[PDB]
């Protein structure tokens, strides 16, 4: 998919899980998450289109999505062993990388 | 090693893992499928040898390995937990990133 | 960052683990080293810096950081379940990546 409609399974699944009663709800919510943000790394954002691919905007663009995909990876595996608010809080901890990007290169 | 290499790799270890015996045989050969989806990343498909680097191809060609990683990665944890046929059945869904890939690629 | 920095990061934790006691060390020194390999895959290394990036051997350095991640991912898991002592036993097993990635590109 391109890179808006990864931003809103992002978003959507975000709140989710800032409202998510069940771990089993957070677990879904963030299962999406992880592929939408590895779907979104092979993206090139309309700020770096004339960027080249191997410039160091790119690789820290595309290095973001890393920093992303394992913070989803930690909240992940609480939420899979049912610590739900412990998964939530990881959650808040995952936007500060969302608007990091966002600064940079949206 | 090159991609033929780390695909026979990859399908050697999927039958141990649905003929598996134990959680440790079933660890063992996701481990191996965990190090051969890595190195396969580094190669350029026939496919697309004639095709840039940068292509939406390669990209999506690349993407294929970090689903296949991540779905590897939650199967181990399967396994490591001890859930042997929880962990095949994961491995069963896997395959459908296998076939994706190949209808694409191959 | 830049590798060298980086780098630094990785050593100084990888020290902090072989001493630590308590899991609550190396859980923290792991996730920093964690960091640092990510962050880190975005370099060109000296060696390298008269190769494509898309050369066989840029493929295969930041294939190095791939594994490394993966297997700080594993020390971090058992870190996490409070086994201070399997953890650092997979610690000495992350040097042999240290040590084939700077006899190749260091
Ligand atoms: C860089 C690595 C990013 C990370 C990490 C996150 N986002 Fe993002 N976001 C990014 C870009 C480059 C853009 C603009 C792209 C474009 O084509 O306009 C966005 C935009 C959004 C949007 C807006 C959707 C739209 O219709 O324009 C949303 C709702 C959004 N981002 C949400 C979001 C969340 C919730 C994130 C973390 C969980 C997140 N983004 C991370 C780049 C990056
Ligand atoms: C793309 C992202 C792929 C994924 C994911 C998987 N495979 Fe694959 N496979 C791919 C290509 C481009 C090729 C052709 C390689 C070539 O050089 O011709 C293959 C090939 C195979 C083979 C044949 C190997 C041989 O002896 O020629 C096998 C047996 C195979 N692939 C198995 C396999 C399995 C079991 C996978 C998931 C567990 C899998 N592949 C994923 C591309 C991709
Ligand atoms: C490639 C994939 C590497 C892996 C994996 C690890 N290291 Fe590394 N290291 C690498 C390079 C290319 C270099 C040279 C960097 C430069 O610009 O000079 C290094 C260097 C170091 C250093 C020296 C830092 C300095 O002051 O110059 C240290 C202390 C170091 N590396 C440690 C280290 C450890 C502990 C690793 C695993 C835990 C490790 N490195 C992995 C490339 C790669
Ligand atoms: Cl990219
Ligand atoms: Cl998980
Ligand atoms: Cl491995
Ligand atoms: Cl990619
Ligand atoms: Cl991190
Ligand atoms: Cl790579
Ligand atoms: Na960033
Ligand atoms: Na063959
Ligand atoms: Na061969
Ligand atoms: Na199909
Ligand atoms: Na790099
Ligand atoms: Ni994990």
Redo the contacts between chains.
């Keep these: 998919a391109d890179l808006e409609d990864n931003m809103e399974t992002l978003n959507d699944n975000l709140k989710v899980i800032e409202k998510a009663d069940n771990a089993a709800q957070v677990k879904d919510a963030l299962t999406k998450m ?2 939408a943000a ?2 979104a ?2 993206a090139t954002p309309p700020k770096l289109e004339d960027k080249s ?2 410039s ?1 905007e790119m ?2 663009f595309r ?1 973001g999505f ?2 992303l995909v ?1 913070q989803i ?1 930690d909240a992940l ?1 609480l939420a899979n062993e049912g610590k739900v608010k412990e998964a939530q809080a990881a959650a808040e901890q995952l936007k500060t990388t969302c608007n990091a990007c966002h600064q940079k290169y949206r």
């Design positions: 992880r592929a590895l779907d790394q092979k691919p191997d160091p690789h820290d290095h890393n920093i394992w990876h595996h």
